């Protein structure tokens, strides 16, 4: 078939679709995607048609992306319209709350202030802020305008019912729903703030830049952050009410046909997109505005495949829209994310011994669990520093640090009889890594090595190795020992995965093992009874030091590659306080005074430590760690990181 059935919501849109269908047939070969045109009465009918497999694709505003995600529709974002420019594609805008500098209040102190809105029923100006504030509104919250009129002391809410709720028009009497009103729209709401009518303007990240050319003027303004702090107006990416995708093509989550849709649209923009100047133009139409796509669009970007609608819309936006749609209002239990049947059994027991203060969700991989913390299905997990990096890039923050005694030591272990090996040159040698992306076995050693050879294709530096998480055909999977689909997997059914697995990898096959300072002592001298380790002696192994010589294993203090940031618990900023407080209550009750090895927490850890200043991944991991990880991800995978980076480069 190879047919993409596009859904139109108007007769004009169907006519353009039909033109679209006919022109693509001149540019796409026989074996290529074709266009079919389905005509429905509304966006929701298109959503339902696609879910019913009567059509396949439609482009929607953010609100309808949410509707399309809810059961029984279950559509997913697949292609994004971008704007502005090809070198700097603009896919999202940011809803922000702008205030005057030194006005002395935060997001959680908006009650009784004067508010400026773009217009009632608009996203940045109304639905997003009121959605976020919904449970702060006084009861009864229906009708919504009466509740807002009793929340702010006075407002300019263009198009509000000022006859029944005059407070909403105090700053623009009559609540004029047109440009005839000086405070209507994006520039109008900001002017409401600039002129001193209101205390806060609910606008987009760009509004202040388009109305105030001089930076000195903009320096008299600030942004309200959802964490109840303020930031300058050029830091909206760390200080907004919501991140909003402008226009998104959706498709069924299963059954697609996403690859066809992208193939179709990518070819359409190459032949009929911006500045192509054919008789057919994808981003205009002689009759009507914004048919099928926005006329201001400059092209399409493929949405990363790990992305679902909740992750695409973002936590803040989904919170606001859900409050509007559902209208439900209440620390509460901390929902821990477990990774295996063995990890879930542990926290299940933790939950019942915590008497409800702990609850348990399970996902099949670390990244899935991270996605659940981002969208609110989960709340906290403990992660290696490399995953704290991914969690941080995805908007999460470190809340507590696992303390085992300043971090643990990353060391390079070699067999003592191999006296030739030095850190100075290990090219062509066989390497053993915890897994790609982890602190001790990858980010620290391969970050340092990156500085020496100025590239990160390490399978061409080492002859072969085991680095679980590498591509199955890579030479860094050749030494691994998992069988079938398990070979080179970053989990337990790969016997060379982890701190201990990488040491075993060295004992049996490798030349160098990148692990931590306790690994060799803990799996030598009979402490590990498994046949591969049982008769090993730790004086038969040395550590490579940075200067180029070697020392014994217990001399790691003066022969390590770098100090490693300890594993940390991560959560969202809105649960940071509660997770901080509930876990210290839990370790006071069940602390150091797992059934297998290292479930939920490292068994080395004695306590969960306070972070104080270092409550962001950049400040927790440190400057050089982040730089090295930034260097290594040019060669790295991680579909989650790709999805998070798509929303924040
Ligand atoms: Fe680690
Ligand atoms: Ru007409």
PDB file of N, CA, C and O in Angstrom, residues 44 47-48 50-52 60 62-77 250-253 308-310 313 317-319 321-326 377:
ATOM      1  N   UNK A  44     -11.186  16.560  16.434  1.00  0.00           N
ATOM      2  CA  UNK A  44     -11.460  15.383  17.251  1.00  0.00           C
ATOM      3  C   UNK A  44     -11.964  14.225  16.400  1.00  0.00           C
ATOM      4  O   UNK A  44     -11.653  13.060  16.682  1.00  0.00           O
ATOM      5  N   UNK A  47      -8.893  12.784  14.973  1.00  0.00           N
ATOM      6  CA  UNK A  47      -8.252  11.966  16.006  1.00  0.00           C
ATOM      7  C   UNK A  47      -8.926  10.602  16.084  1.00  0.00           C
ATOM      8  O   UNK A  47      -8.270   9.556  16.012  1.00  0.00           O
ATOM      9  N   UNK A  48     -10.256  10.596  16.165  1.00  0.00           N
ATOM     10  CA  UNK A  48     -10.986   9.336  16.261  1.00  0.00           C
ATOM     11  C   UNK A  48     -10.865   8.508  14.988  1.00  0.00           C
ATOM     12  O   UNK A  48     -10.800   7.277  15.059  1.00  0.00           O
ATOM     13  N   UNK A  50      -8.231   8.408  12.966  1.00  0.00           N
ATOM     14  CA  UNK A  50      -6.897   7.811  12.982  1.00  0.00           C
ATOM     15  C   UNK A  50      -6.848   6.647  13.963  1.00  0.00           C
ATOM     16  O   UNK A  50      -6.329   5.570  13.650  1.00  0.00           O
ATOM     17  N   UNK A  51      -7.394   6.843  15.167  1.00  0.00           N
ATOM     18  CA  UNK A  51      -7.419   5.763  16.147  1.00  0.00           C
ATOM     19  C   UNK A  51      -8.189   4.555  15.630  1.00  0.00           C
ATOM     20  O   UNK A  51      -7.849   3.414  15.961  1.00  0.00           O
ATOM     21  N   UNK A  52      -9.215   4.782  14.810  1.00  0.00           N
ATOM     22  CA  UNK A  52     -10.007   3.710  14.223  1.00  0.00           C
ATOM     23  C   UNK A  52      -9.383   3.131  12.961  1.00  0.00           C
ATOM     24  O   UNK A  52     -10.022   2.311  12.294  1.00  0.00           O
ATOM     25  N   UNK A  60      -1.706  19.015  14.740  1.00  0.00           N
ATOM     26  CA  UNK A  60      -2.517  19.553  15.821  1.00  0.00           C
ATOM     27  C   UNK A  60      -1.748  20.522  16.706  1.00  0.00           C
ATOM     28  O   UNK A  60      -0.528  20.429  16.854  1.00  0.00           O
ATOM     29  N   UNK A  62      -1.123  22.006  20.624  1.00  0.00           N
ATOM     30  CA  UNK A  62      -0.711  21.234  21.794  1.00  0.00           C
ATOM     31  C   UNK A  62      -1.906  20.649  22.533  1.00  0.00           C
ATOM     32  O   UNK A  62      -1.880  19.481  22.937  1.00  0.00           O
ATOM     33  N   UNK A  63      -2.957  21.446  22.727  1.00  0.00           N
ATOM     34  CA  UNK A  63      -4.127  20.949  23.434  1.00  0.00           C
ATOM     35  C   UNK A  63      -4.696  19.691  22.805  1.00  0.00           C
ATOM     36  O   UNK A  63      -5.043  18.737  23.507  1.00  0.00           O
ATOM     37  N   UNK A  64      -4.771  19.658  21.473  1.00  0.00           N
ATOM     38  CA  UNK A  64      -5.315  18.491  20.799  1.00  0.00           C
ATOM     39  C   UNK A  64      -4.322  17.334  20.765  1.00  0.00           C
ATOM     40  O   UNK A  64      -4.738  16.173  20.702  1.00  0.00           O
ATOM     41  N   UNK A  65      -3.018  17.616  20.828  1.00  0.00           N
ATOM     42  CA  UNK A  65      -2.050  16.539  21.019  1.00  0.00           C
ATOM     43  C   UNK A  65      -2.355  15.792  22.309  1.00  0.00           C
ATOM     44  O   UNK A  65      -2.251  14.560  22.376  1.00  0.00           O
ATOM     45  N   UNK A  66      -2.766  16.526  23.345  1.00  0.00           N
ATOM     46  CA  UNK A  66      -3.147  15.896  24.603  1.00  0.00           C
ATOM     47  C   UNK A  66      -4.401  15.046  24.432  1.00  0.00           C
ATOM     48  O   UNK A  66      -4.435  13.881  24.847  1.00  0.00           O
ATOM     49  N   UNK A  67      -5.448  15.621  23.828  1.00  0.00           N
ATOM     50  CA  UNK A  67      -6.671  14.863  23.576  1.00  0.00           C
ATOM     51  C   UNK A  67      -6.383  13.604  22.771  1.00  0.00           C
ATOM     52  O   UNK A  67      -6.955  12.540  23.035  1.00  0.00           O
ATOM     53  N   UNK A  68      -5.490  13.708  21.784  1.00  0.00           N
ATOM     54  CA  UNK A  68      -5.182  12.566  20.931  1.00  0.00           C
ATOM     55  C   UNK A  68      -4.459  11.465  21.699  1.00  0.00           C
ATOM     56  O   UNK A  68      -4.528  10.295  21.307  1.00  0.00           O
ATOM     57  N   UNK A  69      -3.759  11.818  22.780  1.00  0.00           N
ATOM     58  CA  UNK A  69      -3.017  10.830  23.556  1.00  0.00           C
ATOM     59  C   UNK A  69      -3.928  10.012  24.462  1.00  0.00           C
ATOM     60  O   UNK A  69      -3.682   8.820  24.669  1.00  0.00           O
ATOM     61  N   UNK A  70      -4.980  10.623  24.995  1.00  0.00           N
ATOM     62  CA  UNK A  70      -5.835   9.936  25.951  1.00  0.00           C
ATOM     63  C   UNK A  70      -6.524   8.729  25.321  1.00  0.00           C
ATOM     64  O   UNK A  70      -6.875   8.735  24.135  1.00  0.00           O
ATOM     65  N   UNK A  71      -6.686   7.679  26.123  1.00  0.00           N
ATOM     66  CA  UNK A  71      -7.478   6.534  25.710  1.00  0.00           C
ATOM     67  C   UNK A  71      -8.889   7.002  25.358  1.00  0.00           C
ATOM     68  O   UNK A  71      -9.401   7.949  25.964  1.00  0.00           O
ATOM     69  N   UNK A  72      -9.535   6.375  24.367  1.00  0.00           N
ATOM     70  CA  UNK A  72      -9.054   5.233  23.592  1.00  0.00           C
ATOM     71  C   UNK A  72      -8.335   5.637  22.309  1.00  0.00           C
ATOM     72  O   UNK A  72      -8.181   4.806  21.416  1.00  0.00           O
ATOM     73  N   UNK A  73      -7.910   6.896  22.210  1.00  0.00           N
ATOM     74  CA  UNK A  73      -7.271   7.357  20.981  1.00  0.00           C
ATOM     75  C   UNK A  73      -5.827   6.868  20.892  1.00  0.00           C
ATOM     76  O   UNK A  73      -5.457   6.167  19.943  1.00  0.00           O
ATOM     77  N   UNK A  74      -4.997   7.240  21.871  1.00  0.00           N
ATOM     78  CA  UNK A  74      -3.630   6.728  21.994  1.00  0.00           C
ATOM     79  C   UNK A  74      -2.781   7.084  20.776  1.00  0.00           C
ATOM     80  O   UNK A  74      -2.063   6.244  20.232  1.00  0.00           O
ATOM     81  N   UNK A  75      -2.867   8.331  20.330  1.00  0.00           N
ATOM     82  CA  UNK A  75      -1.973   8.786  19.275  1.00  0.00           C
ATOM     83  C   UNK A  75      -0.687   9.335  19.890  1.00  0.00           C
ATOM     84  O   UNK A  75      -0.609   9.610  21.094  1.00  0.00           O
ATOM     85  N   UNK A  76       0.325   9.498  19.044  1.00  0.00           N
ATOM     86  CA  UNK A  76       1.677   9.835  19.446  1.00  0.00           C
ATOM     87  C   UNK A  76       2.212  10.910  18.506  1.00  0.00           C
ATOM     88  O   UNK A  76       1.839  10.942  17.331  1.00  0.00           O
ATOM     89  N   UNK A  77       3.056  11.814  19.007  1.00  0.00           N
ATOM     90  CA  UNK A  77       3.716  12.782  18.115  1.00  0.00           C
ATOM     91  C   UNK A  77       4.778  12.097  17.274  1.00  0.00           C
ATOM     92  O   UNK A  77       5.584  11.321  17.789  1.00  0.00           O
ATOM     93  N   UNK A 250       0.487  13.818  14.391  1.00  0.00           N
ATOM     94  CA  UNK A 250       0.254  12.693  15.285  1.00  0.00           C
ATOM     95  C   UNK A 250      -0.113  11.466  14.471  1.00  0.00           C
ATOM     96  O   UNK A 250      -0.641  11.560  13.357  1.00  0.00           O
ATOM     97  N   UNK A 251       0.129  10.303  15.068  1.00  0.00           N
ATOM     98  CA  UNK A 251      -0.219   9.036  14.453  1.00  0.00           C
ATOM     99  C   UNK A 251      -0.490   8.029  15.556  1.00  0.00           C
ATOM    100  O   UNK A 251      -0.214   8.280  16.730  1.00  0.00           O
ATOM    101  N   UNK A 252      -1.031   6.879  15.168  1.00  0.00           N
ATOM    102  CA  UNK A 252      -1.251   5.805  16.127  1.00  0.00           C
ATOM    103  C   UNK A 252       0.063   5.394  16.780  1.00  0.00           C
ATOM    104  O   UNK A 252       1.115   5.358  16.137  1.00  0.00           O
ATOM    105  N   UNK A 253      -0.003   5.091  18.077  1.00  0.00           N
ATOM    106  CA  UNK A 253       1.187   4.667  18.808  1.00  0.00           C
ATOM    107  C   UNK A 253       1.715   3.343  18.287  1.00  0.00           C
ATOM    108  O   UNK A 253       2.932   3.140  18.205  1.00  0.00           O
ATOM    109  N   UNK A 308       6.835   9.960  23.722  1.00  0.00           N
ATOM    110  CA  UNK A 308       5.386   9.849  23.781  1.00  0.00           C
ATOM    111  C   UNK A 308       4.804  11.243  24.002  1.00  0.00           C
ATOM    112  O   UNK A 308       5.535  12.226  24.156  1.00  0.00           O
ATOM    113  N   UNK A 309       3.473  11.328  24.019  1.00  0.00           N
ATOM    114  CA  UNK A 309       2.825  12.636  24.099  1.00  0.00           C
ATOM    115  C   UNK A 309       3.122  13.342  25.419  1.00  0.00           C
ATOM    116  O   UNK A 309       3.365  14.555  25.432  1.00  0.00           O
ATOM    117  N   UNK A 310       3.088  12.614  26.540  1.00  0.00           N
ATOM    118  CA  UNK A 310       3.335  13.258  27.828  1.00  0.00           C
ATOM    119  C   UNK A 310       4.748  13.820  27.892  1.00  0.00           C
ATOM    120  O   UNK A 310       4.960  14.940  28.368  1.00  0.00           O
ATOM    121  N   UNK A 313       4.828  16.911  25.397  1.00  0.00           N
ATOM    122  CA  UNK A 313       4.188  18.105  25.943  1.00  0.00           C
ATOM    123  C   UNK A 313       4.933  18.616  27.169  1.00  0.00           C
ATOM    124  O   UNK A 313       4.996  19.828  27.403  1.00  0.00           O
ATOM    125  N   UNK A 317       3.144  21.354  31.303  1.00  0.00           N
ATOM    126  CA  UNK A 317       1.982  21.528  30.437  1.00  0.00           C
ATOM    127  C   UNK A 317       0.904  20.493  30.739  1.00  0.00           C
ATOM    128  O   UNK A 317      -0.287  20.823  30.808  1.00  0.00           O
ATOM    129  N   UNK A 318       1.299  19.227  30.903  1.00  0.00           N
ATOM    130  CA  UNK A 318       0.316  18.172  31.146  1.00  0.00           C
ATOM    131  C   UNK A 318      -0.388  18.403  32.476  1.00  0.00           C
ATOM    132  O   UNK A 318      -1.592  18.147  32.611  1.00  0.00           O
ATOM    133  N   UNK A 319       0.341  18.910  33.471  1.00  0.00           N
ATOM    134  CA  UNK A 319      -0.286  19.264  34.739  1.00  0.00           C
ATOM    135  C   UNK A 319      -1.381  20.303  34.527  1.00  0.00           C
ATOM    136  O   UNK A 319      -2.512  20.136  34.998  1.00  0.00           O
ATOM    137  N   UNK A 321      -3.092  21.255  31.781  1.00  0.00           N
ATOM    138  CA  UNK A 321      -4.240  20.860  30.972  1.00  0.00           C
ATOM    139  C   UNK A 321      -5.101  19.846  31.721  1.00  0.00           C
ATOM    140  O   UNK A 321      -6.335  19.903  31.668  1.00  0.00           O
ATOM    141  N   UNK A 322      -4.468  18.933  32.462  1.00  0.00           N
ATOM    142  CA  UNK A 322      -5.224  17.949  33.232  1.00  0.00           C
ATOM    143  C   UNK A 322      -6.073  18.617  34.306  1.00  0.00           C
ATOM    144  O   UNK A 322      -7.215  18.208  34.545  1.00  0.00           O
ATOM    145  N   UNK A 323      -5.535  19.644  34.969  1.00  0.00           N
ATOM    146  CA  UNK A 323      -6.330  20.396  35.934  1.00  0.00           C
ATOM    147  C   UNK A 323      -7.558  21.011  35.276  1.00  0.00           C
ATOM    148  O   UNK A 323      -8.658  20.977  35.841  1.00  0.00           O
ATOM    149  N   UNK A 324      -7.392  21.581  34.080  1.00  0.00           N
ATOM    150  CA  UNK A 324      -8.534  22.153  33.373  1.00  0.00           C
ATOM    151  C   UNK A 324      -9.532  21.074  32.982  1.00  0.00           C
ATOM    152  O   UNK A 324     -10.736  21.213  33.215  1.00  0.00           O
ATOM    153  N   UNK A 325      -9.046  19.992  32.369  1.00  0.00           N
ATOM    154  CA  UNK A 325      -9.949  18.954  31.884  1.00  0.00           C
ATOM    155  C   UNK A 325     -10.688  18.276  33.034  1.00  0.00           C
ATOM    156  O   UNK A 325     -11.914  18.117  32.991  1.00  0.00           O
ATOM    157  N   UNK A 326      -9.962  17.880  34.078  1.00  0.00           N
ATOM    158  CA  UNK A 326     -10.521  17.030  35.125  1.00  0.00           C
ATOM    159  C   UNK A 326     -11.009  17.800  36.343  1.00  0.00           C
ATOM    160  O   UNK A 326     -12.012  17.410  36.950  1.00  0.00           O
ATOM    161  N   UNK A 377       4.494   9.315  36.729  1.00  0.00           N
ATOM    162  CA  UNK A 377       4.100   7.959  37.095  1.00  0.00           C
ATOM    163  C   UNK A 377       4.949   7.429  38.242  1.00  0.00           C
ATOM    164  O   UNK A 377       4.456   6.655  39.071  1.00  0.00           O
TER     165      UNK A 377
END
